[PDB]
C-alpha cells in the first residue's frame, strides 16, 4: 500500500473504534483523558460540562449492567403456565418490552445530562476558549454519545441535527462512521416519506442527503477514483 492508503486504513480502524459501543476499557480511557484535559483547560464551566457528560455516560453504563442482570433473573425462573408456543412468545415479547422501556428511560436521563453538559459549554462565551482542543474534544464526545444513545433505540430522525452539529466540529466531517450514520438516518426518513405518502420535496431532500453522505463515506474509506467510489457515482449519475 501507498503512504496515503496505509494512513487511511489505520484512520478508518481508529474511527470505527471511536464509535465503538461503550464498555469499561473505553469508559476508563475516555474519562481519564477528559479529566487530564479539564486540568489543562482550568475552566469551571468545562469542568461542570464534563461532570454532567460523565453522569450521562454513567447512566448508559448502569443500564447495560441492569439489562444483563434482568435477562439473567428472568432466564432463571420456572414457567409452569408455558404449555403452548404462543405463551412462550408472549412472555418473550413482555420481557423485551420491559427491557426497551427501561433503556428508553436510561436514554432520557442520559440525554438530560448531555443537554446539561452542552448548556455548561454554552456558557463559555470567549471565542478563544470555544476554539480550545479541550472544548472541541468534550463537545464531540457529548454529541457522539448522544447520537449513539438514540441510534441504539432506532430514534434515527433525532440523530440528524446532532450528527450535523458533530461533523461541523474539528474535521469530524472526515469520519467515515459519521457519514455512514447520517446516510442511514436520511435513508430511514426517505422510507418514512414513501410509507406515509408524504410530500415529494421531502422525499427528494432525504434521498439527496442520503446519497451525498453515502458517496462521502465511500470516498473517505475507499478513496477518490476507487472501484467503489466510481460505482456509487455511476449509480447516482
Amino acid at each position: 500500500l501507498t503512504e496515503d492508503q496505509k494512513k487511511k486504513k489505520k484512520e478508518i480502524m481508529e474511527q470505527e473504534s471511536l464509535w465503538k459501543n461503550p464498555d469499561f476499557k473505553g469508559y476508563n480511557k475516555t474519562f481519564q483523558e477528559l479529566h487530564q484535559l479539564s486540568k489543562t483547560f482550568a475552566n469551571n464551566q468545562f469542568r461542570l460540562a464534563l461532570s454532567n457528560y460523565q453522569s450521562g455516560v454513567n447512566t448508559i453504563m448502569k443500564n447495560r449492567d441492569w439489562v444483563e442482570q434482568y435477562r439473567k433473573e428472568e432466564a432463571e425462573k420456572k414457567r409452569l403456565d408455558e404449555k403452548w408456543y404462543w405463551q412462550k412468545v408472549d412472555r418473550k415479547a413482555r420481557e423485551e418490552r420491559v427491557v426497551y422501556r427501561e433503556k428508553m428511560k436510561a436514554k432520557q436521563d442520559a440525554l438530560n445530562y448531555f443537554s446539561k453538559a452542552i448548556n455548561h459549554l454554552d456558557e463559555i462565551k470567549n471565542p478563544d476558549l470555544r476554539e480550545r482542543p479541550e472544548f472541541k474534544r468534550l463537545l464531540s464526545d457529548v454529541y457522539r454519545s448522544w447520537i449513539m444513545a438514540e441510534y441504539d433505540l432506532q430514534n434515527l430522525p433525532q440523530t440528524i441535527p446532532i450528527l450535523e452539529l458533530y461533523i461541523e466540529i474539528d474535521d469530524n466531517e472526515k469520519e467515515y462512521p459519521a457519514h455512514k450514520y447520517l446516510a442511514s438516518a436520511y435513508s430511514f426518513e426517505e422510507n418514512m416519506i414513501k410509507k406515509t405518502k408524504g410530500p415529494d420535496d421531502m422525499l427528494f431532500k432525504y434521498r439527496y442527503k442520503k446519497n451525498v453522505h453515502l458517496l462521502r463515506a465511500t470516498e473517505l474509506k475507499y478513496g477518490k477514483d476507487s472501484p467503489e467510489y466510481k460505482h456509487i457515482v455511476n449509480v447516482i449519475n
Partner: peptide
C-alpha cells in the same frame, strides 16, 4: 468502577 468513582494509577 463503583458508581461515581474514578481510579488513576
Amino acid at each position: 468502577l463503583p458508581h461515581k468513582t474514578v481510579l488513576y494509577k
